[PDB]
């Protein structure tokens, strides 16, 4: 069913899947109600989260996290983990003895919700700070924009 790929039954804790309904409603349509919310800072909840079917407890829009604290950006560099990506933040650090700059970088592991598809290497991602979700992830993807050179 492309949903129950685990050894426990995956469901959204807030929605109830065992409502007692009539035969006409049974023959009408078999669509579950879906829990979603807004990451309310001028961030639009995507349609793939509202109309989707996936289950992710660490998703900003459908899971159990809240976005509070910093909001940063990065470029996607690696996408080889399961529901998390590794992004890169480049910056310039000012050495004031020389009055010059050196280029520095920080690698950041962020949680990518399944509602963001067609995320490529090099696309600009906007992440927001949440509570600790694993040992090394603290930020959660909220927006994706493509690279300006790509059509």
């Amino acid at each position: 069913a492309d949903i129950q790929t685990e050894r426990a039954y995956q469901k959204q804790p807030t929605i109830f899947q065992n409502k007692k309904r009539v035969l006409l409603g049974e023959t009408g349509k078999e669509k579950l109600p879906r829990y979603y919310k807004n990451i309310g800072l001028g961030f639009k909840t995507p349609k793939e989260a509202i109309e989707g079917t996936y289950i992710d407890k660490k998703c900003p829009f459908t899971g159990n996290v809240s976005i509070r604290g910093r909001i940063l950006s990065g470029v996607v560099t690696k996408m080889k983990m399961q529901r998390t990506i590794v992004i890169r933040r480049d910056y310039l650090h000012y050495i004031r003895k020389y009055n010059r700059f050196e280029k520095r970088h920080k690698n950041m592991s962020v949680h990518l919700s399944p509602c963001f598809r067609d995320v490529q290497i090099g696309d600009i991602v906007t992440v927001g700070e949440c509570r600790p979700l694993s040992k090394t992830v603290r930020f959660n993807v909220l927006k994706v924009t493509k690279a300006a050179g790509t059509k």
Binding site: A8, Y9, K20, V22, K135, T136
Partner: protein, 205 residues
């Protein structure tokens, strides 16, 4: 003792780090509560801040819910059949959170017959004590028989719940965490969750 600090582990680069302080009492871990089925034996724990944790070591009775119709009853745990974390805990009959349990179904059948007045989990022979014809086949008034008619208009439940009542023991999921609560509360499995757990149990064999 058991320490659940983050500084004993390695760094994100994989290098090892030196501790700058020794183990603190706010970083402690306690030995696990392997709650089992048996007559009630629970131990209270003093925790951080002078508050109380209840550590259940032997439990046999909880309360469980039909959520389709919002009715819960205090009943008995009978057996452990599935655990998504470890099958060794099924073999040891360990009560944890989200372990699949089968429980006694007598209060639920009792409420269903005292409310909807239809037989539940009954054989073709249907030999009943006279209290059951008193409950199922009482004498009522016009308003009451009418209200019962629109009550049995929708009093049809799933065939799988019928099959489990035919068997006599209901499947449920323990939703409380018993080593911290001293209770093994939960909810009766229904719907796609019920077919999931049935096919996983059958796929174990």
């Amino acid at each position: 003792g058991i320490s659940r600090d983050n500084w004993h582990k390695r760094r994100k680069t994989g290098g090892k780090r030196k501790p700058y302080h020794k183990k603190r009492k706010y970083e402690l871990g306690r030995p696990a509560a392997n709650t089992k089925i048996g007559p009630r034996r629970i131990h209270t724990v003093r925790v951080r801040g002078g508050n109380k944790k209840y550590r259940a070591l032997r439990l046999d009775v909880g309360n469980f819910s039909w959520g389709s119709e919002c009715c819960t009853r205090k009943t008995r745990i009978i057996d452990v059949v599935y655990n998504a974390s470890n099958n060794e805990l099924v073999r040891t009959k360990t009560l944890v959170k989200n372990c699949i349990v089968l429980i006694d179904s007598t209060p639920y059948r009792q409420w269903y017959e005292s409310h909807y007045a239809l037989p539940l989990g009954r054989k073709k022979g249907a030999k009943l004590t006279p209290e059951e014809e008193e409950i199922l086949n009482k004498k009522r008034s016009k308003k009451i028989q009418k209200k019962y008619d629109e009550r049995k208009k929708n009093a049809k439940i799933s065939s799988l719940l019928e099959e489990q009542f035919q068997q006599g023991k209901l499947l449920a999921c323990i939703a409380s965490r018993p080593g911290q609560c001293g209770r093994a509360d939960g909810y009766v499995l229904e719907g796609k969750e019920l077919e999931f757990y049935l096919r996983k149990i059958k796929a174990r064999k």
